[PDB]
Amino acid sequence: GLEAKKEENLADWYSQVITKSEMIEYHDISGCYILRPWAYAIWEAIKDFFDAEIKKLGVENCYFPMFVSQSALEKEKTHVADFAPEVAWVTRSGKTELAEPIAIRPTSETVMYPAYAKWVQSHRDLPIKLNQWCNVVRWEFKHPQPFLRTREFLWQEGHSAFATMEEAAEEVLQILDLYAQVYEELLAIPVVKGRKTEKEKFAGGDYTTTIEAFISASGRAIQGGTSHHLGQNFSKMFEIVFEDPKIPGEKQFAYQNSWGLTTRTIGVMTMVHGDNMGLVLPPRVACVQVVIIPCGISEEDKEALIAKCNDYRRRLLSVNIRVRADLRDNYSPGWKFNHWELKGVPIRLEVGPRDMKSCQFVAVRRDTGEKLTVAENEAETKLQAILEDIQVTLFTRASEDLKTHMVVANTMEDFQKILDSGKIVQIPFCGEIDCEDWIKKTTAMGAKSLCIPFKPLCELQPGAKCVCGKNPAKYYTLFGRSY
Amino acid sequence: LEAKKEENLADWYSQVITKSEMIEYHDISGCYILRPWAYAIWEAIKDFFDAEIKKLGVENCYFPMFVSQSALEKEKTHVADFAPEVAWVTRSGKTELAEPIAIRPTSETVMYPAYAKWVQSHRDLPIKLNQWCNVVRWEFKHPQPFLRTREFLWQEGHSAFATMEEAAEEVLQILDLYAQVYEELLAIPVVKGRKTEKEKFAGGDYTTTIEAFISASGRAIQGGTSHHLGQNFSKMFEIVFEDPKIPGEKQFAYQNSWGLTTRTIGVMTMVHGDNMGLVLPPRVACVQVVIIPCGILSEEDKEALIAKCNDYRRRLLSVNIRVRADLRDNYSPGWKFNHWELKGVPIRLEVGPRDMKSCQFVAVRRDTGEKLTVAENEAETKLQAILEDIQVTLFTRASEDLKTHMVVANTMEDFQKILDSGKIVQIPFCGEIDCEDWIKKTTARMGAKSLCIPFKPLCELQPGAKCVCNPAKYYTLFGRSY
Ligand SMILES: Nc1ncnc2c1ncn2[C@@H]1O[C@H](COP(=O)(O)OP(=O)(O)NP(=O)(O)O)[C@@H](O)[C@H]1O
Numbered sequence: 001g002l003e004a005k006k007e008e009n010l011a012d013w014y015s016q017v018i019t020k021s022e023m024i025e026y027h028d029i030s031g032c033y034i035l036r037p038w039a040y041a042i043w044e045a046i047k048d049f050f051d052a053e054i055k056k057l058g059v060e061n062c063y064f065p066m067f068v069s070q071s072a073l074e075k076e077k078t079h080v081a082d083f084a085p086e087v088a089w090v091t092r093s094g095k096t097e098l099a100e101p102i103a104i105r106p107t108s109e110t111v112m113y114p115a116y117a118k119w120v121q122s123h124r125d126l127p128i129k130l131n132q133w134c135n136v137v138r139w140e141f142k143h144p145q146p147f148l149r150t151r152e153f154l155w156q157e158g159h160s161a162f163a164t165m166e167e168a169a170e171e172v173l174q175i176l177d178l179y180a181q182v183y184e185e186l187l188a189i190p191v192v193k194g195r196k197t198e199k200e201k202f203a204g205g206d207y208t209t210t211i212e213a214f215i216s217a218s219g220r221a222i223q224g225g226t227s228h229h230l231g232q233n234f235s236k237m238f239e240i241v242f243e244d245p246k247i248p249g250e251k252q253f254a255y256q257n258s259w260g261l262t263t264r265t266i267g268v269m270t271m272v273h274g275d276n277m278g279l280v281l282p283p284r285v286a287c288v289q290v291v292i293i294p295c296g297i298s299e300e301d302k303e304a305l306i307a308k309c310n311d312y313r314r315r316l317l318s319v320n321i322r323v324r325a326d327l328r329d330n331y332s333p334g335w336k337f338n339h340w341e342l343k344g345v346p347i348r349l350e351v352g353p354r355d356m357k358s359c360q361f362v363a364v365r366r367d368t369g370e371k372l373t374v375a376e377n378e379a380e381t382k383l384q385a386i387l388e389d390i391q392v393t394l395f396t397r398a399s400e401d402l403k404t405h406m407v408v409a410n411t412m413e414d415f416q417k418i419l420d421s422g423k424i425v426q427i428p429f430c431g432e433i434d435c436e437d438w439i440k441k442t443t444a445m446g447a448k449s450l451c452i453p454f455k456p457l458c459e460l461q462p463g464a465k466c467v468c469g470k471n472p473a474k475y476y477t478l479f480g481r482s483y
Numbered sequence: 484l485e486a487k488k489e490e491n492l493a494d495w496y497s498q499v500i501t502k503s504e505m506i507e508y509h510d511i512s513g514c515y516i517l518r519p520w521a522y523a524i525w526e527a528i529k530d531f532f533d534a535e536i537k538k539l540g541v542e543n544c545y546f547p548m549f550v551s552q553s554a555l556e557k558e559k560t561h562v563a564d565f566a567p568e569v570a571w572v573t574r575s576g577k578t579e580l581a582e583p584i585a586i587r588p589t590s591e592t593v594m595y596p597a598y599a600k601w602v603q604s605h606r607d608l609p610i611k612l613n614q615w616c617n618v619v620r621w622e623f624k625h626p627q628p629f630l631r632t633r634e635f636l637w638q639e640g641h642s643a644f645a646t647m648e649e650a651a652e653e654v655l656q657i658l659d660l661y662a663q664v665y666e667e668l669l670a671i672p673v674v675k676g677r678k679t680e681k682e683k684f685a686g687g688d689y690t691t692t693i694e695a696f697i698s699a700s701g702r703a704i705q706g707g708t709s710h711h712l713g714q715n716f717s718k719m720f721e722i723v724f725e726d727p728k729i730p731g732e733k734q735f736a737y738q739n740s741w742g743l744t745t746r747t748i749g750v751m752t753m754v755h756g757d758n759m760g761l762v763l764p765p766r767v768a769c770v771q772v773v774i775i776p777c778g779i780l781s782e783e784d785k786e787a788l789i790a791k792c793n794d795y796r797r798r799l800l801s802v803n804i805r806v807r808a809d810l811r812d813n814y815s816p817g818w819k820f821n822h823w824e825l826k827g828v829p830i831r832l833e834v835g836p837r838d839m840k841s842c843q844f845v846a847v848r849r850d851t852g853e854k855l856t857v858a859e860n861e862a863e864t865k866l867q868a869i870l871e872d873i874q875v876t877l878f879t880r881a882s883e884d885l886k887t888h889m890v891v892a893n894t895m896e897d898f899q900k901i902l903d904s905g906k907i908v909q910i911p912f913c914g915e916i917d918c919e920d921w922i923k924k925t926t927a928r929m930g931a932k933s934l935c936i937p938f939k940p941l942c943e944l945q946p947g948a949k950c951v952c953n954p955a956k957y958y959t960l961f962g963r964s965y
Pocket residue numbers: 107138140147148149150151152153155223224225226260261262263264483
């Protein structure tokens with residue numbers, strides 16, 4: 001039974017939803033959480049989709065070491081020194097001090113790029129396109145939250161190297177679109193594609209692209225995934241070079257990208273679609289789409305009810321519906337109703353003795369709570385149609401929620417007003433770091449830049465000025481409070 | 484390849500794994516990069532094993548890599564001898580942690596306290612969980628790519644049951660799946676058995692194992708492990724329930740655990756690899772057939788030759804053969820032949836202009852080097868037949884190799900002579916630990932350890948037969964080992 005209310009105490013609601021749905025168990029180490037099968041199945045679904053898509057682009061999976069030597073991690077300016085407090089260091093095996101401390105990967109640039117340098121011995125060795133599914137550790141300073149901000153997390157990280165900037169540029173947007181597909185088509189979460197400002201972009205790259213989602217309940221936006229064009233920044237640092245085809249004796253530096261997406265996805269799904277009855281799973285990622293529960297309780301008559309439930313589950317597996325028959329005798333129908341509702345199963349298939357004799361059943365959709373009596377003969381078609389509509393409804397409702405909470409403002413006064421109402425807002429922005437710092441300080445709790453959107457809500461007025469008082473606007477920029 | 488397998492195994496192994504593009508070396512000792520060619524084998528193993536354990540009702544999950552100091556030391560989960568293998572995180576940045584944190588060497592200490600919370604009644608059992616994850620053990624022993632690494636990839640399955648019998652059943656089901664991984668996928672013959680008292684997992688009831696033999700080394704290697712833990716861990720962690728029908732009695736869960744690692748790939752390499760390089764069993768080969776255009780004619784004709792190679796690719800994909808067309812024009816056919824030979828692609832398909840005009844192609848088997856001219860129309864049928872034959876060929880060769888190198892001995896001196904010829908030996912054994920300590924010392928004066936007590940030993944132990952030492956309990960496989 002879900003106790004807490006989403007609009008009252010979000011922290012309590014979230015904790016209750018992730019535990020009662022059997023997604024998460026708490027660990028004795030801060031910021032670490034056990035991913036039980038219910039949570040892990042969602043990651044496997046995201047993985048199956050994304051992996052097949054990057055394979056089509058020619059990306060190959062690999063596995064690089066988790067340990068990075070002190071030398072390698074600090075070899076070059078791969079990361080700003082401000083990341084130092086996030087690195088977890090192994091310093092001994094048993095009671096025996098290691099000659100040099102070793103770091104647990106916070107990301108794999110420093111481990112992969114020296115290998116890239118060895119492997120690139122001519123123009124013929126490019127492109128290199130590698131991905132790995134692995135765990136990552138960062139000793140996060142912010143309050144830890146299951147999925148959203150964890151000390152250990154699962155991710156994929158892709159790292160590509162090309163001869164030309166144009167090849168690289170294409171991939172950045174192709175991957176970002178895949179991330180947008182993960183959120184919008186799998187998880188039914190609308191996102192805003194954009195580029196990070198000078199201040200917020202990855203310091204090791206030329207430009208950073210991002211997808212941003214919004215969590216209404218929190219009044220906070222969240223970065224869903226990241227895709228960088230690194231340019232020649234890392235290839236100059238690690239000497240990833242090839243001979244110029246036309247001119248003898250000239251070095252050419254490889255163009256590089258990196259991109260990543262994490263189990264944060266599941267938290268966003270939870271925060272966006274979850275209600276006061278628990279988790280709500282988009283049909284596309286639900287490992288159980290339909291749960292069959294026998295209702296009502298002769299000895300031979302119960303055998304026939306079970307047989308009908310088994311008939312429904314056999315037929316549903318025939319049309320590639322992911323179905324579970326909960327034929328357990330140790331649990332009451334009521335318990336089961338609640339159990340699978342908390343777990344967010346899109347459709348409950350109720351079979352009673354009364355409905356069975358009328359050659360019919362009841363379909364209860366998780367999202368709206370709507371109950372539909374349908375005839376037995378149309379089980380395959382109707383249930384597949386309801387699953388499709390649940391997926392559409394979840395996306396539609398979240399889209400209207402984003403449309404409501406993301407508006408335009410052109411002055412600092414209206415900006416403050418809209419941000420304090422629990423919304424994010426697109427403002428004319430000069431792009432300066434000075435001004436961005438100033439925006440953060442004045443609104444503080446303080447609003448941060450999220451992205452410069454690819455497709456802003458409004459076009460910029462001819463000669464429009466920044467929310468500042470000294471500079472013209474370069475672009476509409478999405479600002480808000482964030483995770 | 485510069486080195487030869489029969490003279491310098493270590494040099495050969497290093498050359499095979501690098502020139503097949505499986506492994507790159509890292510600057511941390513005992514840590515190796517798995518490039519795509521290696522990682523694809525692991526994905527193939529994963530795909531098979533994952534599907535099979537799902538059929539048994541096992542679900543995947545992910546438990547944390549970090550084990551708190553207090554959790555690692557809470558119960559007698561592992562012997563004290565393991566302590567030096569534990570890698571400890573002691574600081575974040577320059578800030579020392581109040582209490583140090585261990586990296587997962589295995590997950591009992593993180594999983595079993597969760598199992599104890601999750602089991603509130605009989606209806607909470609069985610629990611059947613698996614994770615695919617990385618593990619760290621600061622190995623004192625000589626590290627080798629795949630076979631013995633400081634970081635490795637594995638699956639660990641941990642199950643809890645209401646009854647001993649359910650648990651006992653799963654133990655042998657999992658060991659058979661490991662045998663299938665070796666025998667059916669990687670074409671490696673293995674010996675199923677129980678570990679001796681000295682060699683078993685200390686806290687468990689009994690340990691079952693699959694042992695493989697690497698002829699080049701004259702050394703055996705454990706391929707996978709499946710333990711019945713009985714109620715030993717459930718008593719420690721309080722994984723308990725009470726049955727209302729049996730009032731006043733605590734029912735401790737019966738547990739198993741089991742694991743298999745990337746060592747698999749190293750065994751495959753060591754067993755099937757030759758002096759031309761890697762040899763991939765077709766069942767795990769991510770590229771089963773490579774199509775190479777030869778004898779390259781106008782651009783129009785070159786286009787036609789490429790289109791023919793592409794037509795073979797589509798036809799092969801159509802019958803579920805994993806195929807690649809190496810259509811790169813920066814390299815010669817001769818360079819490609821060698822390149823894919825080194826990578827152990829089972830079949831090379833040669834297509835030249837004369838072949839097109841004749842309606843034929845050339846297929847070359849990696850395992851034997853046999854070159855066959857095949858009628859164009861028979862491509863799907865013949866190449867599938869050849870792939871099936873390569874797999875059988877590899878398994879037969881390896882099977883005949885084990886059978887030759889595993890024989891029965893009945894005395895300490897016969898045992899010694901056979902062992903020193905680079906073989907493994909089934910001997911009458913009493914079962915006592917001290918006797919096994921004695922054997923390891925005597926055989927060295929590079930000693931021989933117990934491998935397993937085979938489920939189906941070569942010879943039946945006659946009543947009243949004495950140990951090589953006490954009367955013998957069973958024939959036991961012994962040998963030099965990784
Ligand atoms: N501690 C964390 N736990 C879970 N997911 C995370 C965490 N940190 C980042 N992510 C997500 O995973 C991706 C990690 O790539 P990265 O670009 O390194 O994030 P980041 O720049 O550190 N973000 P932030 O820490 O919010 O400033 C991001 O796009 C986030 O969606």
